[PDB]
Write a protein that binds this ligand. Structure first.
Ligand SMILES: CCCCCCCCCCCCCCCCCC(=O)OC[C@H](CO[C@@H]1O[C@H](CO[C@H]2O[C@H](CO)[C@H](O)[C@H](O)[C@H]2O)[C@H](O)[C@H](O)[C@H]1O)OC(=O)CCCCCCCCCCCCCCCCC
Ligand SMILES: CCCCCCCCCCCCCCCCCC(=O)OC[C@H](CO[C@@H]1O[C@H](CO[C@H]2O[C@H](CO)[C@H](O)[C@H](O)[C@H]2O)[C@H](O)[C@H](O)[C@H]1O)OC(=O)CCCCCCCCCCCCCCCCC
Ligand code: CLA
Ligand code: CLA
Ligand code: CLA
Ligand code: CLA
Ligand code: CLA
Ligand SMILES: CCCCCCCCCCCCCCCC(=O)OC[C@H](CO[C@@H]1O[C@H](CS(=O)(=O)O)[C@@H](O)[C@H](O)[C@H]1O)OC(=O)CCCCCCCCCCCCCCC
Ligand SMILES: CC1=CCCC(C)(C)[C@H]1/C=C/C(C)=C/C=C/C(C)=C/C=C/C=C(C)/C=C/C=C(C)/C=C/C1=C(C)CCCC1(C)C
Ligand SMILES: CC1=CCCC(C)(C)[C@H]1/C=C/C(C)=C/C=C/C(C)=C/C=C/C=C(C)/C=C/C=C(C)/C=C/C1=C(C)CCCC1(C)C
Ligand SMILES: CC1=CCCC(C)(C)[C@H]1/C=C/C(C)=C/C=C/C(C)=C/C=C/C=C(C)/C=C/C=C(C)/C=C/C1=C(C)CCCC1(C)C
Ligand SMILES: [Cl-]
Ligand SMILES: [Cl-]
Ligand SMILES: [Fe+2]
Ligand SMILES: [Mn+2]
Ligand SMILES: [Mn+2]
Lengths: 61, 28, 311, 36, 421, 341, 45, 37, 64, 35
């Protein structure tokens, strides 16, 4: 029950790092945000879902 | 070692955005 | 003009009075004059003040046996603490004088006066249409005066810890501060020393360079009507080609230094003391090998063992 | 318990340079007024 | 372009000055700085929880946010002991996660968002000279601040209460049932003397007064916010103030400078909103605790007492200067005259002796850098430097309004028109 | 042409760093002094001269590392490496404090070389040599403090050691044994230094706040061009400002800059006179009338008497470790204290 | 304690003097153009 | 100490408080890359 | 050039490191090691007493 | 003691009121660039 939470929050850290690196780059770059606008939405939604899941699995630990 | 690696990754994440913007020649 | 109040405003804020009054001068002049006359009267005739609060007064007046160097306005009694102590809050004028009330009067009116002086410098800069940041430069000595007169007594809890209004009293304040806090090892006093030394060096350098390159129009001062040398003395890159940037640096360096030393005094008022390198070197057996910091600590201890004057 | 010539030194070393400066300034102003 | 000295007149080291006349980027910069503040709060809370040693007290571990959370009643039991650090972890996590949202908002409104707001969102745009709109924004944020104060009040009275050092037998988490809503007490606190023995607003010594004052502050802020939303500045206010972004910035700077000085004095002197079980004893508290411990060790197995300047009985010695201290461990031993010797002999409690000894061990003024010392020094320095910033920005706002902040006009220098003095 | 002429031409070449004839004295002496100071603060100990550790090798930091003065057994010896004290042994020369003498002598000659460099460069640019006369201030400071004071004292031991904490020790030692704050020449020096800092700050602020609007940019550093015949700031506005704010103001830019030159130089020379007076223990330590008043009146106390007590405490509590050669042993009973008073 | 007023008579100077001076200012304020300006500061005086 | 599950991520928590300083430095880096224009 | 520096500078840094790690600095400059501040016979601070016999006195003090 | 206190209060109130109402009298307009 603890290893699952640790893996989940490690995935959350990795996704937060990826979003921090990508989102300003995607938005500022004139080439991006047209062919890859939905990628930002999917990444942010996955980030919030990971946050909710970590909050859930914290209760059982 | 973990502290140093995390510090290195965080310190890389900042200028990495600027480098990627320069490569894509965006509004820097 | 159209109103008595308008006429009064046009005279308080007039640029034709030999010395500008201004609105800040409306608060500055009474407070500064009051503090000045009280300081003069106290420096000549004030009775001795029981600064420690243990019924042994200390004389600082010319009439009680002091000279210009040894004369001072003794800080308020330690029994007073930082309680507000005007004349009307004392039972008698004698007890007010005995507890160092004139020190509080002078300090408060002088701080109000220097704040008014900052504001009045800004006000006359605005009246003349010039830039207003001379008062920002003057904030540094005001900050230092408030730190040595108000902030340190607040942090310590008694106006008796404030700097006495004298010469020998100032030296005693410096020695006791070095004993208690080791200000010499504090990086902010080091920054202040760098600021004042650099200010002297830069004033001398700027004066030498301007006087050296005076254009022949003539005493040489009557030649005035109301970079290559520097870049060859050192390497070429180190030179202030821009006169405005050079004067900005001249204004900036000592002001920043005095700001840092005032901040250091304020921090040490709340016991954020200097660096402590005592017993930093030991041998294999564990015996302490003394350094120059150990000698400095010995001197500080020698000063401290004769400040308590009690248990 | 102060000294005695002490007063003589203080008073004269104050006055001798003061009267010299005042005399020099008065002479300069006299020249300026005479020429003008 | 608007992002260079050629098109703006501002160099890179003054580059944020280019944000004065563009609203969207200014809003983004402010939201990004808010995200930075929330990120620091969350990260430092996590850092402090991660370094918290259960046996040591909070003030012996160099912690400054955990005492703030403990004063609110979270994770603290009777006597100031810390039960669990999980609510502190939750606070840190919530702040550090909301920081991501705030940072994204700042980045969006700064980089890709519109530079100006009034052409696309007229409800949010402004000119720095439309007094009605600026007062409306001021009123909205005033309502927000009042609701925050009322949220603190609700935490005090409904959601678990707040820690009280003045509870009998040591501090405890108590619900503030009846706060002081009487305007006389609040006005006397606001109008009290700031000198020794009175202390102005720093001397509030009970939680009921704190909760009542925060009730008054919240409702007053809500009323003033609605007022400034529904009104325009009067003729006396319009002719007295400079109406520009830099002037408003200078006003905020002097306000926060005064607030920083007040907070430094609060951390140094107040032991009610800053409990000594979390922040450590104050300097006067440490000195009086050492004197009281010596008095107790003299009574067991008079020396140690003297009379105050007003005649009351106080502790003797170098502490005499700290006779204005009021601490929970010494109040039961103090009577109308002053400290009572027989009451100290008989009505003393072991927990008072333990508190006195542990406060004697750790002295800010000296009997270990107290967290009170760090807070006081830091916020006093911040207050001073922000007074400097207020002076700079106010002078430059005045000069820029008049049109001479770039230098004197050679064509028409004012001094040359004035007759010589 | 003649060898001299060709050597003079080569030394006067416009290179990145002017060498000149004065360089032949300045560069080696200054380089050796700086390198010797670094070597002493990095490797050389003070264990056999002061009973102290003063090297990075011994564990000291930047503040506590110093090139300590020679042992009090050496006297005012030149401490030549080939001299009778060291006899060519580098290790014994470093142990006896000979590196301090090396640094002091080569640094004095480096200061002389730098003053000559200022003179030379002023003669080539064609300007009046008001530098190397300003530098006479620092030269007098160094000569009085590091050379004349130990020469007047017992040995080089009582000179300042070349370190931060060593300089702080020297300050407190001089205060304890001489009451140098009470010295009027030191007071004039303090006035000169503080007035020079005041002049620098006030002149910088006055010039920055009286500039002419010579540019359309808010940042006004660009509005000054390097070859500007016109003045960049209004002297009349600055004069009016200070005339009506302070009551008096400068009207001559020349005089103002000469005054900004004169104040620190005069302060340094007065302080040098005071230190020369201290060199022979001819100090303004005490006021005889105040001492007589305090002797016949135990209830008479001023801050001067408190300063005297503080100096006595400094001397008594620092003599044992500051002068280990004297073998001072002071019992706790004779050590002054506030309670003992 | 409020404003250090221990004797009611102290309130007479504290209130009458600010009012009287305001009365002098009232005349300056009434002789002015108190219409709104849309600028950084009001040059009408 | 941290809750035991999250105790593994301590090395991130031990560097996170200083991140805003880097932000300031990052700003300078941007002004460096842009050529302090 | 850069190539040269890429060899000279690290070699010089390693030489500076070995000047301390091998104990040559103590021998060259006479700085006492942490285990030889006080000898068994001399537990006091060693101080030179005569200027003209300083070399012999230091040889006697540093012999042990 | 009361009479000195009332005199000081009168003087301080007068000067503070003069300062406050003087800086309320459109002080920004008192600049040489004002038309
Ligand atoms: C304006 C005038 C400025 C000077 C007035 C005095 C400032 C001062 O002594 O402030 C101290 C007061 C607090 O006063 C203390 O307040 C204390 C309250 O504690 C009491 O109440 C507590 C409640 O927990 C405890 O019970 C405690 O035991 C009990 O003693 C005590 O009453 C002390 O006696 C009393 O001294 O802070 C305050 O009122 C808030 C005011 C903060 C002023 C900050 C300093 C002024 C600015 C300097 C700027 C310098 C740099 C710029 C230069 C240009
Ligand atoms: C600005 C322009 C200059 C620019 C900077 C220049 C820097 C370069 C030069 C700096 C160093 C100069 C050499 C100093 C060496 C010295 O002083 O060496 C000192 C020697 C004397 O040595 C001392 O002599 C003293 C007296 O001894 C005599 O008396 C003793 C009594 O017991 C014994 O009998 C003993 O045997 C007997 O010799 C003590 O013994 C001391 O221990 C011993 O160190 O004089 C001598 O070599 C020669 C003495 C002749 C005078 C020459 C120097 C004059 C300078 C001022 C000197 C101090 C005066 C007071 C200043 C305040
Ligand atoms: C916290 C302080 C702060 C803030 C909020 C801002 C904000 C801003 N500045 Mg200022 N500035 C600052 C400090 C700050 N600055 C300092 C210290 C300096 C001196 C070096 C400057 C000097 C300066 C100049 C000279 C200029 C600005 C400008 C700007 C604006 C746009 C910048 C731009 O074009 O980005 C371009 C930068 C990039 C594309 C690279 C950085 C990309 C992002 C921002 C990195 C963020 C990392 C983060 C982890 C991402 C989170 C992602 C999220 C999903 C979680 C913006 C409103 C400009 C402006 O708009 O003027 C009109 C301008 O001309 N600033
Ligand atoms: C408190 C500061 C602040 C302010 C004043 C604004 C103001 C604005 N934002 Mg920004 N924003 C902020 C914080 C802020 N935002 C933050 C923290 C985020 C991150 C979530 C965003 C993310 C964001 C996006 C992504 C967008 C805006 C947009 C807008 C504009 C339309 C919003 C509106 O009408 O509200 C309507 C009311 C609500 C949305 C409230 C609903 C929830 C309760 C407006 C100028 C939009 C725009 O185009 O303007 C630039 C837009 O697309 N904002
Ligand atoms: C951050 C909050 C904030 C801000 C920026 C403003 C800003 C403004 N208000 Mg608003 N206001 C606010 C909160 C705020 N108000 C609240 C909470 C209320 C409810 C009470 C009001 C009620 C209000 C009214 C009724 C009026 C204003 C007016 C004004 C304008 C001029 C104010 C002035 O000159 O001060 C003048 C300040 C004083 C005369 C000082 C009074 C101080 C009192 C006596 C307390 C003293 C405390 C202490 C002893 C001294 C301070 C010490 C310090 C360390 C705390 C200005 C636009 C006026 C205007 O033109 O708008 C229409 C106006 O008529 N405000
Ligand atoms: C909320 C507070 C606030 C706000 C919004 C502003 C906003 C502004 N100020 Mg003001 N200012 C303030 C507070 C504030 N200031 C305070 C408190 C001071 C006193 C110190 C000043 C002093 C000041 C001056 C003297 C000037 C401004 C200027 C400016 C403008 C440009 C700022 C810029 O580009 O920064 C650029 C940012 C930098 C160059 C970075 C500076 C970094 C500092 C020196 C380091 C300090 C230590 C650091 C915090 C520790 C981190 C360690 C790290 C280095 C490793 C802008 C309108 C300038 C201007 O154009 O006027 C309109 C100007 O000349 N301000
Ligand atoms: C500008 C160059 C310069 C100057 C002015 C000095 C000056 C000095 N050095 Mg330094 N030195 C220099 C270069 C210089 N040195 C260089 C390049 C080295 C590296 C080799 C050294 C290494 C060095 C050491 C190691 C020591 C000195 C010492 C001294 C001092 C004693 C000089 C002495 O009596 O020697 C005597 C010799 C001469 C003066 C040479 C003169 C030759 C004459 C003029 C030619 C005629 C000879 C004659 C015909 C033959 C008989 C003196 C202050 C000593 C000292 O005081 O330290 C405490 C010391 O120990 N120097
Ligand atoms: C504008 C420039 C003004 C310059 C003068 C300002 C005031 C200087 C200080 C005067 C002072 O300290 O007097 C001390 C006395 C009280 O002394 C007290 O007087 C008491 C007796 S009684 O109250 O006066 O009846 C008694 O306690 C004792 O004599 C003594 O302590 O205060 C006064 O009586 C002054 C009242 C008039 C003030 C005019 C101003
Ligand atoms: C904790 C957290 C939560 C979990 C998720 C997470 C994403 C992993 C994480 C978030 C992390 C975040 C928000 C990470 C963001 C991290 C950032 C903003 C890192 C920026 C680094 C930039 C540096 C160090 C610049 C150095 C420049 C220097 C020293 C020189 C500058 C010089 C230049 C060139 C110009 C001249 C001047 C000077 C100053 C001399
Ligand atoms: C769940 C979990 C369990 C426990 C462990 C755990 C991992 C800690 C936790 C995770 C929590 C998590 C995942 C927390 C999430 C943390 C994150 C990713 C926080 C990031 C915030 C971004 C900010 C403040 C950036 C603002 C941008 C700015 C200031 C840019 C400004 C710029 C402008 C505009 C323009 C140029 C100038 C500059 C200044 C460069
Ligand atoms: C990090 C840091 C923070 C703040 C900023 C900062 C200060 C810039 C920075 C510091 C950086 C640092 C740490 C900078 C430090 C750099 C260092 C340690 C430079 C050392 C240079 C040594 C020299 C020149 C010795 C030469 C020897 C000679 C001449 C021999 C002389 C000989 C002697 C002994 C006598 C006998 C004869 C001979 C043989 C002639
Ligand atoms: Cl004690
Ligand atoms: Cl003393
Ligand atoms: Fe100049
Ligand atoms: Mn003290
Ligand atoms: Mn002491």
């Amino acid at each position: 029950m603890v290893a699952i939470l640790q893996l989940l929050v490690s995935m959350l850290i990795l996704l937060s790092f990826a979003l921090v690196v990508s989102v300003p780059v995607i938005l500022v770059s004139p080439g991006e945000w047209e062919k890859s606008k939905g990628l930002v939405y999917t990444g942010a939604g996955l980030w919030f879902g990971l946050v909710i899941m970590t909050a859930a699995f914290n209760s059982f630990v | 070692v973990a502290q140093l690696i995390s510090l290195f990754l965080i310190l890389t994440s900042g200028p990495a955005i600027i480098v990627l913007i320069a490569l894509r020649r965006g509004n820097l | 003009s159209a109103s008595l109040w308008e006429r009064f405003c046009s005279w308080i804020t007039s640029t034709e009075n030999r010395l500008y009054i201004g609105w800040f001068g409306v608060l500055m002049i009474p407070t500064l004059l009051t503090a000045t006359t009280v300081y003069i009267i106290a420096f000549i005739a004030a009775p001795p003040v029981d600064i420690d609060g243990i019924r042994e007064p200390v004389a600082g007046s010319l009439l009680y046996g002091n000279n210009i160097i040894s004369g001072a306005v003794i800080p308020s009694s330690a029994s007073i603490g930082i309680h507000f102590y005007p004349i009307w809050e004392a039972a008698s004028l004698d007890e007010w004088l005995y507890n160092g009330g004139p020190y509080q009067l002078i300090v408060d009116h002088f701080l109000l006066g220097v704040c008014g002086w900052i504001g009045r410098e800004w006000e006359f800069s605005y009246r003349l249409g010039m830039r207003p940041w001379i008062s920002v430069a003057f904030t540094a000595p005001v900050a230092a005066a408030s730190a040595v007169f108000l902030v340190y007594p607040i942090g310590q809890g008694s106006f008796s810890d404030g700097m006495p209004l004298g010469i020998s009293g100032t030296f005693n304040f410096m020695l006791v501060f070095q004993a208690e806090h080791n200000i010499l090892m504090h990086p902010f006093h080091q920054l202040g020393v760098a600021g004042v030394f650099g200010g002297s060096l830069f004033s001398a350098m700027h004066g030498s360079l301007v006087t050296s390159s005076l254009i022949r129009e003539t005493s040489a001062n009557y030649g005035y009507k109301f970079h290559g040398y520097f870049g060859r003395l050192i390497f070429q890159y180190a030179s202030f080609n821009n006169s405005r940037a050079l004067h900005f640096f001249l204004g900036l360096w000592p002001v920043v230094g005095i700001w840092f030393t005032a901040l250091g005094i304020m921090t040490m008022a709340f016991n954020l003391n200097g660096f402590n390198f005592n017993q930093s070197v030991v041998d294999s057996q564990g015996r302490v090998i003394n350094t120059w910091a150990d000698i400095l600590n010995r001197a500080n201890l020698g000063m401290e063992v004769m400040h308590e004057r009690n248990a | 318990n102060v000294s005695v010539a002490a007063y003589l030194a203080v008073l004269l070393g104050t006055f001798v340079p003061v009267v010299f400066l005042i005399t020099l300034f008065i002479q300069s102003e006299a020249r300026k007024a005479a020429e003008s | 372009a608007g992002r260079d000295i050629e098109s703006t007149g501002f160099a890179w080291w003054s580059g944020n000055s280019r944000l004065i006349n563009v609203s969207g980027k200014l809003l983004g910069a402010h939201v990004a700085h808010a995200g930075l503040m929330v990120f620091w709060c969350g990260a430092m809370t996590l850092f402090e929880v991660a370094h918290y040693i259960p046996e040591k007290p909070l003030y012996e571990q160099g912690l400054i946010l955990l005492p703030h959370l403990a004063s609110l009643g979270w994770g603290v039991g009777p006597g100031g002991e810390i039960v669990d650090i999980y609510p502190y972890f939750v606070v840190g996590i919530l702040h550090i996660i909301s920081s991501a949202v705030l940072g994204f908002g700042g980045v969006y409104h700064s980089l890709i968002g519109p530079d100006t707001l009034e052409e696309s969102f007229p409800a949010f745009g402004y000119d720095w000279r439309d007094k009605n709109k600026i007062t409306t924004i001021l009123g909205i944020h005033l309502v927000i601040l009042g609701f925050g104060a009322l949220l603190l009040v609700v935490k005090a009275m409904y959601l678990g209460g707040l820690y009280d050092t003045w509870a009998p037998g040591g501090g405890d988490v108590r619900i503030i049932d009846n706060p002081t809503l009487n305007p006389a007490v609040i006005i006397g606190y606001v109008l009290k003397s700031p000198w020794g023995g009175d202390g102005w607003i720093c001397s509030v010594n009970n939680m009921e007064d704190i909760v009542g004052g925060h009730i008054w502050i919240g409702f007053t802020c809500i009323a003033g916010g609605f007022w400034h939303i529904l009104t325009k500045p009067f003729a006396w206010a319009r002719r007295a103030y400079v109406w520009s972004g830099e002037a408003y910035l200078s006003y905020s700077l002097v306000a926060v400078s005064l607030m920083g000085f007040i907070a430094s004095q609060y951390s140094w002197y107040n032991n009610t909103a800053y409990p000594s079980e979390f922040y450590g004893p104050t300097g006067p508290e440490a000195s009086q605790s050492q004197a009281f411990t010596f008095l107790v060790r003299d009574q067991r197995l008079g020396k140690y007492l003297m009379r105050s300047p007003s005649g009351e009985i106080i502790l003797g010695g170098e502490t005499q200067r700290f006779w204005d201290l009021r601490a929970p461990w010494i109040e039961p031993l103090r009577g109308p005259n002053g400290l009572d010797l027989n009451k100290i002999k008989n009505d003393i409690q072991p927990w008072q002796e333990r508190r006195a000894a542990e406060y004697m061990t750790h002295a800010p003024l000296g009997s270990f850098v107290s967290p009170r010392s760090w807070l006081t020094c830091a916020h006093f320095l911040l207050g001073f430097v922000f007074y400097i910033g207020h002076l700079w920005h106010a002078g430059r706002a005045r000069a820029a309004a008049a049109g001479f902040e770039k230098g004197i006009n050679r064509e028409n220098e004012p001094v040359l028109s004035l007759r010589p003095i | 042409r003649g060898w001299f002429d060709l050597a003079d031409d080569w030394l006067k070449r416009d290179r990145f760093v002017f060498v000149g004839w004065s360089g032949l004295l300045l560069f080696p002496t200054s380089y050796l002094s700086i390198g010797g100071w670094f070597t002493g603060t990095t490797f050389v100990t003070s264990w056999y001269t002061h009973g102290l550790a003063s090297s990075y090798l011994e564990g000291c930091n930047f503040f506590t590392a110093a090139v300590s003065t020679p042992a009090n057994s050496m006297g005012h010896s030149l401490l030549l490496l080939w001299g009778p004290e060291a006899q060519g042994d580098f290790t014994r020369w470093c142990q006896i404090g000979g590196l301090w003498a090396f640094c002091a002598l080569h640094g004095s000659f480096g200061l002389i070389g730098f003053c000559l460099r200022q003179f030379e460069i002023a003669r080539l640019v064609g300007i009046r040599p008001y530098n190397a006369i300003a530098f006479s201030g620092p030269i007098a400071i160094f000569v009085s403090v590091f050379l004349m004071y130990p020469l007047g004292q017992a040995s080089w031991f009582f000179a300042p050691s070349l370190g931060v904490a060593a300089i702080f020790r020297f300050l407190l030692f001089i205060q304890g044994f001489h009451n140098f704050t009470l010295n009027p020449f030191h007071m004039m020096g303090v006035a000169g230094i503080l007035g020079a800092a005041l002049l620098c700050a006030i002149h910088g602020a006055t010039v920055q706040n009286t500039i002419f609007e010579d540019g359309d940019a808010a940042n006004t550093f660009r509005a000054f061009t390097p070859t500007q015949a016109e003045e960049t700031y209004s002297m009349v506005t600055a004069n009016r400002f200070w005339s009506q704010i302070f009551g008096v103001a400068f009207s001559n830019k020349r005089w103002l800059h000469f005054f900004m030159l004169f104040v620190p130089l005069a302060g340094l020379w007065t302080s040098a006179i005071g230190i020369v007076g201290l060199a022979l223990n001819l100090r303004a330590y005490d006021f005889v009338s105040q001492e007589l008043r305090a002797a016949e009146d135990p209830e008479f106390e001023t801050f001067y008497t408190k300063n005297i007590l503080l100096n006595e405490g400094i001397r008594s509590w620092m003599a044992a470790q500051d002068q280990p050669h004297e073998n001072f042993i002071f019992p706790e009973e004779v050590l002054p204290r506030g309670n003992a008073l | 304690e409020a404003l250090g007023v221990d004797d009611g008579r102290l309130l007479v100077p504290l209130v009458l003097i600010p009012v009287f001076v305001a009365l002098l200012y009232g005349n300056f304020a009434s002789t002015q153009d108190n219409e709104d300006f849309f600028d950084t500061y009001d040059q009408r005086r | 100490k941290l809750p035991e599950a999250y105790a593994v991520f301590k090395p991130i928590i031990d560097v996170a408080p200083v991140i805003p300083v880097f932000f300031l430095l990052l700003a300078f880096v941007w002004q460096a890359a842009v050529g302090f224009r | 050039y850069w190539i040269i520096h890429s060899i000279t500078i690290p070699a010089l840094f390693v030489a500076g490191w070995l000047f301390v790690s091998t104990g040559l600095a103590y021998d060259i400059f006479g700085t006492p090691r942490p285990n030889e501040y006080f000898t068994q016979e001399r537990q006091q601070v060693p101080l030179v007493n005569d200027r003209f016999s300083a070399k012999q006195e230091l040889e006697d003090l540093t012999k042990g | 003691m009361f009479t000195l206190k009332i005199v000081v209060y009168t003087t301080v109130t007068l000067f503070v009121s003069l300062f406050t109402f003087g800086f309320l009298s459109n002080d920004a307009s008192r600049n040489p660039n004002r038309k």
